[PDB]
């Protein structure tokens, strides 16, 4: 038919509109529609009598791009007017929370939150951003929320909470949102700010591994650091402790290890007031 | 701290237990996944021989240490999956059968290792409850499938799939409404991509019960109108489109026709030409 229009759109429905085409008279109207993404899709079809200039398509997925064609079939079945349109269905609120919530850095006044986006299939509409809420753990007050950009092209998302109190436990949640509304919140993350007295946790990273050895490095930490302690253990085994008197030290190579064995490794910094909070704990398998 | 014990486990909690022959007790715990994790810590009095850790993730494996030293491992209790299966795909393969396929929900939403899936189906046009069938989890595989059979012909069915684990059942996928074939008109060919070039696209489909009199190949640009290539030849089972534009996305699908008329279409392909 000529002048095919999507007259109105819902999140799961769309009303299609056209005008009577060139007439051999029209036997029926044939409506095809399918998802407009890459890869093979289902070709949905639906008939309408020649007396109708309209139809409502139902059971569509929200926030999804569709292509649709109306065909005016003929007696002759030849040269039958066709026209294809493209549209996107209305939005619905995200149905899944962000995942893999993660603390990256910490200070006495700041907390760096990171998270991965909920899977695209649960967006039901392109995300407009995220809400990061936080509160002190033992407080009746509600969460106070901060707005973050969606950055939908990035794998990782992050936000730095600041102007916090020292040595305080905060509860953190993240929600995604789009034009329709807000999705569910992630599970509570309970994070304690530093004290500003003990050393900050080092940033430990894997340097090298072999059949018998593992090497790791970390950045120097901020009252003068008097030393570091490296901790390690087999996945089935007790913790062992390598004391590093040297504060020039930012590297260490474990030796005499077992082949094809997973070791855990983390580092702590010490100053005159005692041992600071630990790094992330690494999982490294002995190899080449 | 001798003989550390996980005395009991919940889905987000765990009670830890020990004896010790001291300043304080120091309780470290972390997720037992690969890659760098967060080392969570809590302190407890010297007067306590036990502590309850809170706000753990369900269906998650943890390692734990108590220091006055000794490290144990456990897995938190299960919770029901919180997401439905994705990428639902059903084609009426016959007048009596429908083959359903789906991808698993993202593992972050399992909250416990999946035991399988439930495939529910019912006639659309009459008020009925869904009748559910059990399928194995096959968590190793990327794609999952179930062939619904013993159906009526030329009937519309409503299809849903759910994941489930030891805690219970996850939410269902949105309805897929699919109609079984009539057993008269040709069954929809199964068309797949062979090759693409800057100027061409080549596709294939399966060979043949009533003798097929011909095929029609339909194609169009992502922005454009449908074009129809009639193939009265029923022998070859392949075709190569020519004269296309470079770096352009084309839709393609194939219909078969016999004495009774034109059969239901293929799946619709989306193929982009090379540079
Ligand atoms: Na068209
Ligand atoms: Na501290
Ligand atoms: Na065109």
| Domain of residue A81, CATH code | 2.60.40.10
Q: Considering its fold, how many domains does chain A have in total?
A: 3
- B186: in domain: no
Are A224 and A278 found together in one domain?
Answer: yes
**Do A283 and B36 make contact, defined as CB atoms within 8 angstroms?**
yes
Is residue B200 exposed (0-12), middle (13-18) or buried (19+ Cβ within 10 Å)? Answer: middle
> Which has the closest alpha carbon to B121: B93, B84, B154, B146?
B146
**What is the token pair recorded at B253?**
């699908």
- Rounded Cα distance, B122 and B261, in Å: 29
Query: Taking CB atoms and an 8 Å cut-off, how many pairs form between chains A and B?
Result: 93
CA-based nearest residue to A176, from A101, A94, A90? A94
Asked if residue B124 and residue B57 are part of one domain, the reply reads no
Distance CA A79, CA A246 (A): 86
**Chain A residues with at least one Cβ partner in B under 8 Å:** 34, 36-43, 45, 59, 61, 67, 69, 82-84, 86, 95-96, 99-100, 102-103, 119, 121-122, 187-188, 190, 204, 233, 237-239, 264, 266, 277-283
- Pair (A189, A217) in one structural domain: no
Please measure the distance between the N-terminal and C-terminal CA atoms of chain B and give it in whole angstroms: 67
Q: What's the A81 CA to ligand 3 centre distance in angstroms?
A: 14
Give the end-to-end CA distance of chain A in Å, rounded to a whole number.
Answer: 68
| Phi and psi angles of residue A44, each rounded to the nearest 5 degrees, phi first | -85, 140
Distance between CA A86 and CA B249 in Å, rounded?
Answer: 14
A39 and A109 co-located in one domain: no
Give the residue carrying structure tokens 């038919």. A1
- Residue that is last in its domain, among B180, B213, B232: B180
Q: Is residue A248 part of a domain?
A: yes
Query: What is the spatial distance between Cα A271 and Cα A230, in angstroms, rounded to a whole number?
Result: 15
Ramachandran assignment for B224, one of left (phi > 0), alpha (psi -120 to 50 degrees), beta (any other): left
- Tell whether B172 and B247 lie within a shared domain: no
Out of B53, B76, B99, a domain closes at B76
Q: In this structure, is residue A148 part of a structural domain? A: yes
DSSP annotation of B89 reads E
Distances (CA, A) of A234 to A147, A257, A263, B16, B215: 42, 9, 4, 21, 64
What's the per-residue H, E or C state across B227-239? EEEEECCCCCCEE
Best A1, A13, A39, A57 residue to mutate vs chain B (most B CBs within 10 Å): A39
Query: B79: exposed, middle or buried (C-beta count within 10 Å: 0-12, 13-18, 19+)?
Result: buried
Alpha helices in B164-241 (DSSP H): none
In this structure, the answer to whether residues A106 and A188 fall within a common structural domain is yes
Does any domain span residue B50? yes
Q: From the CA of A163, how many Å to the nearest CA of chain B?
A: 23
Co-location of A189 and A111 in the same domain: yes
Nearest Cα neighbor of A17 from A81, A62, A83 is A83
Give the minimum alpha-carbon distance from B101 to chain A in angstroms, rounded to a whole number: 12
Q: How far does residue A44's CA lie from ligand 1's centre (Å)?
A: 15
Ligand 1 centre to CA of A231 (Å) is 68
Question: Do both A214 and A274 map to the same domain?
Answer: yes
What is the DSSP-derived secondary structure letter of residue A41? Answer: B
Sheet containing A156-161: give its strands across. A99-106, A111-116, A156-161
Residue whose tokens read 């007396």: A51
Are B82 and A96 inside 8 Å of each other by CB? yes
Resolution in A: 2.7
* Residue B35 to chain A, least CA–CA distance (Å): 6
**Is A93 contained in some domain?**
no
Give yes or no: residues B16 and B61 share one domain.
Answer: yes
Are the beta carbons of B162 and B169 closer than 8 angstroms? Answer: yes
Give the 3-state secondary structure percentages of chain B, helix then strand then coil, rounded to 5.
0, 50, 50
Are B207 and B265 part of one and the same domain? yes
Do residues B260 and B197 share a domain?
yes
Q: Is residue B13 part of a domain?
A: yes
Would B64 be classed as within a structural domain?
yes
Q: Which two tokens stand for residue B243?
A: 């004269």
Nearest-Cα residue of chain A relative to residue B255: A43
DSSP conformational letter for A186: P
Alpha carbon of residue B91 to chain centroid: 16
Q: Residues A7, A73: one domain?
A: yes
Range of the domain at B65: 2-76
Q: Which residue of B has its CA nearest to A201?
A: B39
Chain A neighbors of B65, CB-CB under 8 A: 239
Distance between CA atoms of residues A166 and A149, nearest Å: 27
In a domain, B81, yes or no: no
Tell me whether residues A38 and B91 touch, CB distance under 8 A: no
Q: Which of A138, A158, A193 is the last residue of a domain?
A: A193
Residue B109 phi, psi (nearest 5): -105, 5
CA distance B252 to chain A (A): 9
């Amino acid at each position: 038919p000529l002048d095919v229009k999507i007259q109105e759109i819902w999140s799961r429905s769309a009303n299609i509109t056209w005008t009577a085409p060139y007439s051999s008279p029209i036997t029926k109207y044939f409506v095809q529609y399918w998802k407009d993404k890459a890869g093979s899709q289902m070709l949905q079809e639906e008939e309408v009598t020649a007396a109708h200039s309209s139809v409502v398509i139902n059971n569509l997925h929200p926030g999804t791009s569709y292509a649709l064609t109306v065909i005016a079939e003929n007696e002759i079945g030849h040269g039958e007017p066709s026209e294809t349109v493209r549209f996107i269905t209305g939005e619905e609120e995200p149905s899944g929370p962000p995942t893999d919530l993660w603390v990256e850095s910490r200070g006495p006044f700041t907390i760096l939150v990171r998270w991965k986006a909920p899977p695209k299939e649960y967006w039901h509409g392109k995300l407009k951003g995220y809400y990061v809420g936080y509160k002190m753990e033992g407080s009746p007050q509600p969460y106070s929320f901060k707005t973050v950009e969606a950055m939908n092209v990035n794998i990782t998302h992050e936000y730095l909470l600041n102007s916090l109190k020292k040595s305080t436990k905060y509860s953190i949640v993240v929600k995604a949102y789009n034009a329709a509304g807000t999705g569910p919140a992630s599970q509570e993350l309970i994070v304690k700010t530093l004290d500003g007295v003990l050393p900050r946790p080092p940033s430990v990273s894997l340097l090298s591994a072999s059949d018998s050895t593992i090497s790791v490095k970390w950045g120097h930490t901020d009252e003068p650091v008097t030393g570091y302690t490296l901790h390690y253990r087999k996945k089935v085994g007790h913790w062992l402790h390598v004391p590093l008197l040297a504060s020039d030290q930012t590297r260490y190579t474990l030796t005499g290890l077992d082949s094809d064995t997973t070791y855990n490794v983390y580092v702590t910094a010490n100053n005159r007031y005692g041992r600071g909070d630990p790094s992330g704990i690494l999982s490294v398998r002995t190899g080449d």
